[PDB]
Amino acid sequence: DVNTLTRFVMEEGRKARGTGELTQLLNSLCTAVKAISSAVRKAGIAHLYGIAGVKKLDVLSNDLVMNMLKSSFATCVLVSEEDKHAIIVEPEKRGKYVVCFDPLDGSSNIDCLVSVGTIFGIYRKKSTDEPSEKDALQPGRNLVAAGYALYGSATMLVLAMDCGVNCFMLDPAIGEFILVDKDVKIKKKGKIYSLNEGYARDFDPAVTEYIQRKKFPPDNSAPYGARYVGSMVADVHRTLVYGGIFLYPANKKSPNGKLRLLYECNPMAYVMEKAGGMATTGKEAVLDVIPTDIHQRAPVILGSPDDVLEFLKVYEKHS
Amino acid sequence: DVNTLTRFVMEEGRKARGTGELTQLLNSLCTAVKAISSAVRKAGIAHLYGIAGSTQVKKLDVLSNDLVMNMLKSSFATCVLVSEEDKHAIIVEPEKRGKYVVCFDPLDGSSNIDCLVSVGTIFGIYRKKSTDEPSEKDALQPGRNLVAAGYALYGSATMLVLAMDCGVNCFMLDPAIGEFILVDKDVKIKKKGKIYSLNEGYARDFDPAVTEYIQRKKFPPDNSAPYGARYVGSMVADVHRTLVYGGIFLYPANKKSPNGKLRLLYECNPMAYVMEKAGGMATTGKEAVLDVIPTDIHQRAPVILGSPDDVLEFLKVYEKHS
Amino acid sequence: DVNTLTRFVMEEGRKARGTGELTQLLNSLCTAVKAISSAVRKAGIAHLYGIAGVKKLDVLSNDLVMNMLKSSFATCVLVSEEDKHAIIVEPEKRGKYVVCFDPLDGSSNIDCLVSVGTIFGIYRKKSTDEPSEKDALQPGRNLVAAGYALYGSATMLVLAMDCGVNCFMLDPAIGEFILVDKDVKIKKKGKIYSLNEGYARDFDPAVTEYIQRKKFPPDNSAPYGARYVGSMVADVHRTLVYGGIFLYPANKKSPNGKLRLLYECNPMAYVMEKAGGMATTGKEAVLDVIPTDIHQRAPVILGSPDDVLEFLKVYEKHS
Amino acid sequence: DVNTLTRFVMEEGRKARGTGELTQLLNSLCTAVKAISSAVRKAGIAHLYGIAGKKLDVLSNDLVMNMLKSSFATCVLVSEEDKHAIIVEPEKRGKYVVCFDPLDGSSNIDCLVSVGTIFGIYRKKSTDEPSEKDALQPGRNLVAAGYALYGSATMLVLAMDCGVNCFMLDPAIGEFILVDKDVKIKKKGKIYSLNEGYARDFDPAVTEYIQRKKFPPDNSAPYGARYVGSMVADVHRTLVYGGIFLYPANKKSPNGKLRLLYECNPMAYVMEKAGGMATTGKEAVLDVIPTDIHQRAPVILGSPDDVLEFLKVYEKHS
Numbered sequence A, C: 001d002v003n004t005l006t007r008f009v010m011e012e013g014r015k016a017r018g019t020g021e022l023t024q025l026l027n028s029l030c031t032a033v034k035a036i037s038s039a040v041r042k043a044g045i046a047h048l049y050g051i052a053g054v055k056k057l058d059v060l061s062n063d064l065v066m067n068m069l070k071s072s073f074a075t076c077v078l079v080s081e082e083d084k085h086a087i088i089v090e091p092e093k094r095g096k097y098v099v100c101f102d103p104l105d106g107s108s109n110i111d112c113l114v115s116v117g118t119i120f121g122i123y124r125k126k127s128t129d130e131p132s133e134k135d136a137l138q139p140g141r142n143l144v145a146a147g148y149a150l151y152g153s154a155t156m157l158v159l160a161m162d163c164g165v166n167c168f169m170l171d172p173a174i175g176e177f178i179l180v181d182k183d184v185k186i187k188k189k190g191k192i193y194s195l196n197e198g199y200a201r202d203f204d205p206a207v208t209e210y211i212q213r214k215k216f217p218p219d220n221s222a223p224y225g226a227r228y229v230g231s232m233v234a235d236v237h238r239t240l241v242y243g244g245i246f247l248y249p250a251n252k253k254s255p256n257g258k259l260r261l262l263y264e265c266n267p268m269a270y271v272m273e274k275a276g277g278m279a280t281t282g283k284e285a286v287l288d289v290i291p292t293d294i295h296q297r298a299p300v301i302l303g304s305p306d307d308v309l310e311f312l313k314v315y316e317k318h319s
Numbered sequence B: 001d002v003n004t005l006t007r008f009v010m011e012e013g014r015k016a017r018g019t020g021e022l023t024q025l026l027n028s029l030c031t032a033v034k035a036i037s038s039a040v041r042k043a044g045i046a047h048l049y050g051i052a053g054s055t056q057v058k059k060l061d062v063l064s065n066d067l068v069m070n071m072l073k074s075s076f077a078t079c080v081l082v083s084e085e086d087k088h089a090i091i092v093e094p095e096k097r098g099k100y101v102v103c104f105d106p107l108d109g110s111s112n113i114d115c116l117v118s119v120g121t122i123f124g125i126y127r128k129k130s131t132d133e134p135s136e137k138d139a140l141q142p143g144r145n146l147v148a149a150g151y152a153l154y155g156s157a158t159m160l161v162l163a164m165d166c167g168v169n170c171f172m173l174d175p176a177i178g179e180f181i182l183v184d185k186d187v188k189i190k191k192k193g194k195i196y197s198l199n200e201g202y203a204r205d206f207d208p209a210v211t212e213y214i215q216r217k218k219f220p221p222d223n224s225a226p227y228g229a230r231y232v233g234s235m236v237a238d239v240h241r242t243l244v245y246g247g248i249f250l251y252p253a254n255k256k257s258p259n260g261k262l263r264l265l266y267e268c269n270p271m272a273y274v275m276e277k278a279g280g281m282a283t284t285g286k287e288a289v290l291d292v293i294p295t296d297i298h299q300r301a302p303v304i305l306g307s308p309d310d311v312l313e314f315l316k317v318y319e320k321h322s
Numbered sequence D: 001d002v003n004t005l006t007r008f009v010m011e012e013g014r015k016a017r018g019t020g021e022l023t024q025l026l027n028s029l030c031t032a033v034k035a036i037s038s039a040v041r042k043a044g045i046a047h048l049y050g051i052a053g054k055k056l057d058v059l060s061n062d063l064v065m066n067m068l069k070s071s072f073a074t075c076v077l078v079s080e081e082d083k084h085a086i087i088v089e090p091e092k093r094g095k096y097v098v099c100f101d102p103l104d105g106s107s108n109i110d111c112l113v114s115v116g117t118i119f120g121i122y123r124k125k126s127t128d129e130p131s132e133k134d135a136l137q138p139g140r141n142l143v144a145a146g147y148a149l150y151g152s153a154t155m156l157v158l159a160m161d162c163g164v165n166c167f168m169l170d171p172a173i174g175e176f177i178l179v180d181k182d183v184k185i186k187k188k189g190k191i192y193s194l195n196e197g198y199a200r201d202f203d204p205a206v207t208e209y210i211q212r213k214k215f216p217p218d219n220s221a222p223y224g225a226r227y228v229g230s231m232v233a234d235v236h237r238t239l240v241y242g243g244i245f246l247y248p249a250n251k252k253s254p255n256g257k258l259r260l261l262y263e264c265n266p267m268a269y270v271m272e273k274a275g276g277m278a279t280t281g282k283e284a285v286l287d288v289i290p291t292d293i294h295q296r297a298p299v300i301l302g303s304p305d306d307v308l309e310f311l312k313v314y315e316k317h318s
Ligand SMILES: CC(C)=CCC/C(C)=C\CC/C(C)=C/CC/C(C)=C/COP(=O)(O)OP(=O)(O)O
Pocket: A041, A172, A173, A174, B037, B038, B041, B043, B175, B176, C034, C035, C037, C038, C039, C041, C154, C155, C170, C171, C172, C173, C175, D037, D038, D041, D042, D043, D171, D172, D173
C-alpha cells in the first residue's frame, strides 16, 4: 500500500489527537522543500541566461522556508542560519512552535553541484510570555520533530519524530513525497568514516588515534573506507543508510567545532538517536547541550552506535 | 545570446564542415543523458511503490546502459561500443554503422547510488582508424586519439561537460524544458588548488609516494595553509569539483592494486582529456594518461589529475621515490 | 498569503472539527489527480517508443483513483464510470464516505489531444447496513464535496463544498495545487451556448426553439457565441469562468439524455449551484433526482441562472 | 527505432544537403516551443502567488522572437503580437522569413482551453534590404510550416516537402518523440467545426452546407459538431479525426477573421501535405497573394471529400 508524506503526517497527527497545528507546519515545510528542490535543480535557469531575451539559492531557500512557515499559522519563533537574530512571527500568524533550520546546507558545494540540503528542528514554545529569541534556546531533548531534505542524485526527505525515522522519496513527475523506508534503524556498526582530514595537523589527540584505528585496525579487521562529501546532509544521510561514523570535531580554527548546534547538530543527533544511533560532542550527548546562543557551534560525532562508542572509548582514554 | 547544447554542437559541426554524423552522435548522447537524469532523480517512483496498485523495475545501472546503447546505435554514427557493463565491445549492425567508436561508463559511482550521492555518465569518442571489419581492437586507441570526451554529472543539478578541440564547455540542464544551457564557456582549471581528493582509508596500503604527498598537504613544510579534503566517492563528482575549484584528485596504484582501480578506456581517458583541454594534467605517475596504449578494453590505470602545479608537485615526490 | 490545496483542505477540516477522515480522502484524491495529469501529459512516452530499446488512459486513471481512495481508509463504496458494479472497499480499509467519479472524462478527445478531466462527488454513507451500491443512490443534495480536475492548457482542480467553489492551479514544477480563484461565482447571464448541434435533426422541440433564439434573437441583441469542446469538464469549466449555458438535453431517441447522474451531472450541478448557477433536467433540479441505478443517465442544462431560467421558460412552452 | 525531433530534422537536413541554416532554425523553434509549453502549463506559478514572500502572450512572443533571432537563420519575423514586421539586426541575419502566432487561442486562455503556436517558414525571395514585403509571399512558397498544440498533451506537427510528421513532447525529458510518421487525413470525415453563433451572418453556401451536415438529404448519419474555439485545437482534431473546419466571413469579419500569413497558410500547408484541402471558397488558401502581413482570410479546410462537397455547394450559389 502506497503512502505519501501528506497522508503519513496527517495520520500520525490523528493518532496523537493533535489540533492539526503541527500537521500544518509539516505540510508547509514539505511544500517549501519541494520548491527548494526545483530551484536547486535549476528549473527555469534558461530564463536567467536570456532564452526570452536573480536571487541566490541561499536567499531564495531562506525566503521559501520563512514564508511557508509563517503562513502555516503554526510558528512563533524562526531561527535560520541566514539571519543574525531569530525572526518573531507577527501575532496574527502566530502558533506554538519554534523552528530552527538551515535552509540550504553545503555552501562550499553549490558551485560544484555537489549534494546540498535543508535541515530543520521543531520545538514547542514552553512559556506564556511574548515569543523571543530565548525560546529557541532549548536542548535537543525538547525536539518534537526533526529531519532533513537531501537534494542529491534524487530528493529525499527524512523525518524523525517519536514514532521513529521515515524516509520519503520525491517523485518529481507528480511532486509527491513517497514513503520508501519505514521505521529505519542505523546499522549497529559500519565500515565508513567521514571527516575532513585536511585538519589533521590541528586534530584532537583522541581524533588522531581514532582515525588511526580506522586505517590500522588493532583487531586485524578490514580498514574502513573514507568518504567526505563536504555537505553535512549528504555525509549524515550516507551514515544513516550505510552505517559508519561522521565527525566534525574541534580543530584550531573551530575550537567548539564548526557545525551549529540548534539547526545542524541537534536535528541530525535527533534523527540518529531515533534510528538507534548516537551523536556526541565527546563530553556529552549533542541533544543534552543547553545552548546560550542560537548560532553557537558544537563538535559532533555521530553514526552507528558501535562506531560512536569506539570513538568515545578513545576520547575517554585521552580524558 | 542564449546558447543550447543542440545549437552549440550543430554550429561546431558547421564550422568543422562535418557531414553531420558526429553531430547526430552527440545529439543522441544528450537525449540519453536527459533520460538517465530523469530516472536518477526518481521520476515515476510512485508507480514502483504502488500508487496505481500492482498494474522500470530495472536498476539504474542497467537502464542507463540500455539508454546509452540504444541511442548511440540509433544515431547511425557508431560501429564499436565499449561499456563498463559488457565484457566484449558491441559491434553495431551494418545497417546502423557509422565511423565512430564510443567508450562509456553509463552510470559512474555505483557505491553511491543507494545513499543518493552524486553519480554520472562518462564518455569518450574515437574515430575508427582501420579499414578491417569493426571489432574490439578499434577501441584500443590511446587517449590522444580522442575526438570528443566529457561527462554528465547528476548532482544537485545535472550538468553536461563536453570537451573537444575547441576546449571544454559546461551545459546546465534546465529540467523545466529539457534543454542543456551553456553556462560556462572555454573553462580553464586553476593553476593551483587547495583541495586534495582520495580514499585515505587505504592508507595502510599506500604507495610511499602517495604517503609523502598527502603528508605534504596536511603538514606543509613551507608554513603555508594545509589543503582541505574532499572525497565524494564518485569519480564524476570528484573530478568536476577538481575542474571547478582546482586541486588534485588521486586514485593511485597501491600495494594491492598495481594498476589502480579506475578503467583507462571509459573512466581515466575521458577525464584526462577534459583536464588537459582545460589546462590541467592527468598522469599515471609514469606517463600521461592519454599516452597509455591499451591492450584490453577493461584494463585499469592509476590516475592523478587536477591543477598543473598540484600534479607536478606529486610527480616531483613520485620521482624522488623513483 | 499563498495557499495550497493541502493547506486549504486541512484548515477547512480544522474549522469543521472533523476527525480528519474527509481531509485524508481529499489528500488522496489530490495525489491521484496529479498522477493522472502526469500521464495525460504523456510523461515517459519516450520509453513506450523504445528510447531504452498496453494500459489505456482510462484504465490507468481509474486504477489511480481506485487505489488512492482505497488506501485513504476513508471510503467504503466507490462508483466509477469505468466499472460495471459499485466497488466495495475491503473491510479493513473502510471509511464513512462514498465516492462517485469519472476518472477520465472526454474520452473521444484523448487521441486529438483536446482537454480532458476527472469528475468526482463525495457522499457520507447514510446507513449502518453492509456497504453496497445502494449507498451511492443518494440525491445530489446529499453531497459533502464535489468538483473536477481539468487537464487543459494547464491543470486545475475545482473543489466545491459548503464554503463555496475554489479553484487551484497545479504547479508542475513542485506538484502543488495553488489557490488562484477564491469563492468563485458564475455570471448572472452569459453570452455562450454549448451543445452538440450535430444532433439538430433529433432535437427536442424546446431545444430547437431555445437555440434558435440564441442564434436569431428577437431583440436587437447580439447572437450568442458557440463553443462545444466535446469534453464535459472543459465545456462546464468554460461555463463557470465565462458564464452562459451548457446543454446535453434529452431527445426522443435518448429520453434521459446521455450524461450520467452520479459522476457527471450531480458533481457539475453541485459546483454550479455553489457558484450561484443552476442545473436542471427540465423537470427538476439535477441535485433533487433520486437515482435508482448507479449508471442512470440524466438530461442536464446548466450555467448562468438567467440563461437556465430562459431555457426552462422555453421548455415549459413545449410542456 | 526511436526518433526525436532533433534527430529527424537533422537527418532531413543531411538528405537535402542543406548548409544547416534551416536545421538551426527548426532546432531554435523547437526549444522555444518547449519553453512556451512549460509556461502555458503554469510551471512556477506558485512564485507568482507568493510562495517565497509577463503575460503569456508577450512571453511566448519573446521566446519565439529571441530563439529565432539567435538562430542566425532569419531576417524578417512576423508575429501576431507585433504591429510591424521585426527586422533582424544585420549581424544575426539568415535567409529565412518566419510568420507565427506565438500563442493561438489565448483570447480564451482564462478557461484553460487548448492553445498553440502556429508558424510558417519562407525563404527570402527578393534581394532588397529585408523589410515587411519579404513576408508577403503566397503559402505556395512555404518551405516548412506547422504548429505546436498545448492541449491535454503537447505535440508539434511539422509539415515539409517530405510530408507531415507528429512529435509528442515527453515532459519528463523535454524531448519531442516521433509518434506519427507521414500522416494523411481521412478522405472523408464525420465532424464539422465552426462557430454557429454567426448563423445569422452566414452566406447561403455556408448555410446550405451546414444544413446538409445536420439534415443529410441522402438519409446518411448526420455529422457530429465540435468547436473548441482555438484554431490549433480544432484543426489538429480535423487532421487526426478527419472532417471539416470553417471560419467563413461574417458581418464583423467581412474578409474572414483568421490571419492568412500565420494562421491560414500554415494550416493550409499542413492539410495539403496531408492529402487535405484548404480553400477560401474562391481559391486555395496557399495561392492567395498577401498585400498586408496581418490581413485576414476566410478558410474552409479538412478532408478532401468534405471540402469538395462544400465547394460544389459554393459553386451552386456562384
Ligand atoms: C503537473 C503534472 C503532473 C502534469 C500536467 C499539468 C501541468 C500544470 C504542467 C505540465 C507541463 C510540464 C511542463 C510537465 C513537466 C513536469 C515535470 C517533468 C516536472 C519535474 O521536472 P524534472 O525534469 O523532473 O526535474 P528533476 O528531474 O531535476 O527533478
